[PDB]
Design an enzyme around this catalytic site. Sequence first.
Site, PDB file in Angstrom:
ATOM      1  N   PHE A  45      -5.853  -0.238   9.545  1.00  0.00           N
ATOM      2  CA  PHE A  45      -5.723  -0.077   8.090  1.00  0.00           C
ATOM      3  C   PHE A  45      -6.807   0.923   7.618  1.00  0.00           C
ATOM      4  O   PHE A  45      -7.955   0.836   8.063  1.00  0.00           O
ATOM      5  CB  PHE A  45      -5.961  -1.460   7.418  1.00  0.00           C
ATOM      6  N   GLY A  72       7.857   4.120   2.574  1.00  0.00           N
ATOM      7  CA  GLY A  72       8.371   5.330   3.167  1.00  0.00           C
ATOM      8  C   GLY A  72       9.893   5.368   3.150  1.00  0.00           C
ATOM      9  O   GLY A  72      10.573   4.602   2.448  1.00  0.00           O
ATOM     10  N   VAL A 131       5.063  -0.796   3.320  1.00  0.00           N
ATOM     11  CA  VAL A 131       3.780  -1.032   4.000  1.00  0.00           C
ATOM     12  C   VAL A 131       2.905  -1.939   3.187  1.00  0.00           C
ATOM     13  O   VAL A 131       2.597  -1.673   2.008  1.00  0.00           O
ATOM     14  CB  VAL A 131       3.044   0.294   4.221  1.00  0.00           C
ATOM     15  N   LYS A 175       3.836  -2.313   8.562  1.00  0.00           N
ATOM     16  CA  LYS A 175       5.039  -1.605   8.183  1.00  0.00           C
ATOM     17  C   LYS A 175       6.282  -2.444   8.572  1.00  0.00           C
ATOM     18  O   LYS A 175       6.411  -2.848   9.749  1.00  0.00           O
ATOM     19  CB  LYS A 175       5.062  -0.250   8.870  1.00  0.00           C
ATOM     20  N   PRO A 225       0.340  15.237   2.748  1.00  0.00           N
ATOM     21  CA  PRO A 225      -0.893  14.577   2.332  1.00  0.00           C
ATOM     22  C   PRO A 225      -0.824  13.042   2.371  1.00  0.00           C
ATOM     23  O   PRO A 225      -1.831  12.409   2.545  1.00  0.00           O
ATOM     24  CB  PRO A 225      -1.098  15.073   0.915  1.00  0.00           C
ATOM     25  N   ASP A 273       6.674  15.280  10.239  1.00  0.00           N
ATOM     26  CA  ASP A 273       6.551  15.047   8.785  1.00  0.00           C
ATOM     27  C   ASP A 273       5.133  14.928   8.263  1.00  0.00           C
ATOM     28  O   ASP A 273       4.809  13.995   7.569  1.00  0.00           O
ATOM     29  CB  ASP A 273       7.296  13.768   8.353  1.00  0.00           C
ATOM     30  N   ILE A 301       0.817  -1.238   0.000  1.00  0.00           N
ATOM     31  CA  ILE A 301       0.000   0.000   0.000  1.00  0.00           C
ATOM     32  C   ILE A 301       0.836   1.268   0.000  1.00  0.00           C
ATOM     33  O   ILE A 301       0.280   2.386  -0.012  1.00  0.00           O
ATOM     34  CB  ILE A 301      -0.999   0.178   1.242  1.00  0.00           C
ATOM     35  N   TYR A 332      11.455   4.827   5.692  1.00  0.00           N
ATOM     36  CA  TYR A 332      11.708   3.819   6.731  1.00  0.00           C
ATOM     37  C   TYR A 332      11.470   2.387   6.280  1.00  0.00           C
ATOM     38  O   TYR A 332      12.324   1.514   6.474  1.00  0.00           O
ATOM     39  CB  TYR A 332      10.842   4.052   8.002  1.00  0.00           C
TER      40      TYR A 332
HETATM   41  C1  CT9 Z   1       0.869   2.017   8.353  1.00  0.00           C
HETATM   42  C2  CT9 Z   1      -0.365   2.812   8.582  1.00  0.00           C
HETATM   43  C3  CT9 Z   1      -0.064   4.158   9.184  1.00  0.00           C
HETATM   44  C4  CT9 Z   1      -1.405   2.694   7.542  1.00  0.00           C
HETATM   45  C5  CT9 Z   1      -2.739   2.338   7.659  1.00  0.00           C
HETATM   46  N1  CT9 Z   1      -3.279   2.320   6.416  1.00  0.00           N
HETATM   47  N2  CT9 Z   1      -2.326   2.650   5.546  1.00  0.00           N
HETATM   48  C6  CT9 Z   1      -2.395   2.793   4.221  1.00  0.00           C
HETATM   49  N3  CT9 Z   1      -3.583   2.574   3.591  1.00  0.00           N
HETATM   50  C7  CT9 Z   1      -3.820   2.957   2.326  1.00  0.00           C
HETATM   51  C8  CT9 Z   1      -4.552   2.118   1.459  1.00  0.00           C
HETATM   52  C9  CT9 Z   1      -4.794   2.537   0.153  1.00  0.00           C
HETATM   53  C10 CT9 Z   1      -4.321   3.766  -0.270  1.00  0.00           C
HETATM   54  S1  CT9 Z   1      -4.594   4.336  -1.939  1.00  0.00           S
HETATM   55  O1  CT9 Z   1      -5.406   3.330  -2.643  1.00  0.00           O
HETATM   56  O2  CT9 Z   1      -5.195   5.654  -1.794  1.00  0.00           O
HETATM   57  N4  CT9 Z   1      -3.180   4.414  -2.733  1.00  0.00           N
HETATM   58  C11 CT9 Z   1      -2.709   3.216  -3.435  1.00  0.00           C
HETATM   59  C12 CT9 Z   1      -2.367   5.636  -2.762  1.00  0.00           C
HETATM   60  C13 CT9 Z   1      -3.597   4.596   0.592  1.00  0.00           C
HETATM   61  C14 CT9 Z   1      -3.337   4.203   1.890  1.00  0.00           C
HETATM   62  C15 CT9 Z   1      -1.226   3.162   3.548  1.00  0.00           C
HETATM   63  C16 CT9 Z   1      -0.070   3.387   4.283  1.00  0.00           C
HETATM   64  N5  CT9 Z   1       1.109   3.682   3.713  1.00  0.00           N
HETATM   65  C17 CT9 Z   1       1.880   4.897   3.774  1.00  0.00           C
HETATM   66  C18 CT9 Z   1       3.334   4.452   3.697  1.00  0.00           C
HETATM   67  C19 CT9 Z   1       4.244   5.664   3.892  1.00  0.00           C
HETATM   68  C20 CT9 Z   1       3.962   6.310   5.255  1.00  0.00           C
HETATM   69  N6  CT9 Z   1       4.798   7.519   5.409  1.00  0.00           N
HETATM   70  C21 CT9 Z   1       2.482   6.700   5.354  1.00  0.00           C
HETATM   71  C22 CT9 Z   1       1.608   5.475   5.147  1.00  0.00           C
HETATM   72  N7  CT9 Z   1      -0.079   3.220   5.604  1.00  0.00           N
HETATM   73  C23 CT9 Z   1      -1.208   2.878   6.199  1.00  0.00           C
END
Ligand code: CT9
Length: 286
Positions: free
Chosen positions: A75, A13, A18, A33, A123, A120, A10, A15
Amino acid sequence: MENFQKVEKIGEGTYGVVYKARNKLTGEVVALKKIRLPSTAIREISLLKELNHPNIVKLLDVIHTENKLYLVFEFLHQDLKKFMDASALTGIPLPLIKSYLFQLLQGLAFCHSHRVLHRDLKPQNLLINTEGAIKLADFGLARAFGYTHEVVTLWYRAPEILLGCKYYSTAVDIWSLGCIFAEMVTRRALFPGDSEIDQLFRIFRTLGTPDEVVWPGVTSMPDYKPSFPKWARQDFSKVVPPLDEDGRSLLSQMLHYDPNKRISAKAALAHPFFQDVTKPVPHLRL
Ligand SMILES: CC(C)c1cnn2c(Nc3ccc(S(=O)(=O)N(C)C)cc3)cc(N[C@H]3CC[C@H](N)CC3)nc12
């Protein structure tokens, strides 16, 4: 890890990467993560487990194994950037922008009263769900430790950090959220710098070069140079149309140079911009 079945990547980062993941055991859908190759980070990470708020993505667990680290999170299905792209032709309705800003400030006012800064905000660190919620994500991975080398954006960095402040405050998150706030209203990034000096100079061209009159102590700062060109300030009537007078006033205070006069989240919650604040359902498509 044997507890979890990966589903898809998904995100990634600085770090870790995910994954969407399911508990082989419980069917619970989570975000996983991975952080690659110690000691105070553990205590740090574990201190976050306690930092629970409706507007911070929940850290469920910490699995420490074979020098790989994994954080198990609640999530969320989308981030504010993708949502922002999906709204570009019309942009996010003001009552929805106001609701998001309002919930993030409450998020931040919690963070901050407990001494945790995000460091940090951007969006893609902001996540939404179908019930109108926005949550601060990946949070306090700041005073943690340090794989893609993919560049971090500077676009939301506060000027004191760019000028080399070691010991910066909670006010850096407000600067960042105001950057995001203006971006939500305009559909373009406020300060889209592509290096530190360029990021500095873009802030300067919109806000005025800071001096001691607006920012006591500016010139004694590590990365400050007298040879900085002197740009005149612009009114935000030109920076964030068509934001109303309350909104421009709020953004103004969130973008004060001097971190110490920059509005706090708490004060920001009390601003007349939020007199008429509601919680609209967003149309999401997943
Ligand atoms: C680890 C936690 C904080 C969490 C919980 N959900 N999630 C997601 N979900 C997610 C799912 C689909 C998309 S979506 O369909 O718009 N799309 C594909 C863009 C975007 C985000 C994405 C995500 N990843 C980023 C990884 C980098 C970090 N700095 C911030 C979080 N983290 C999470």
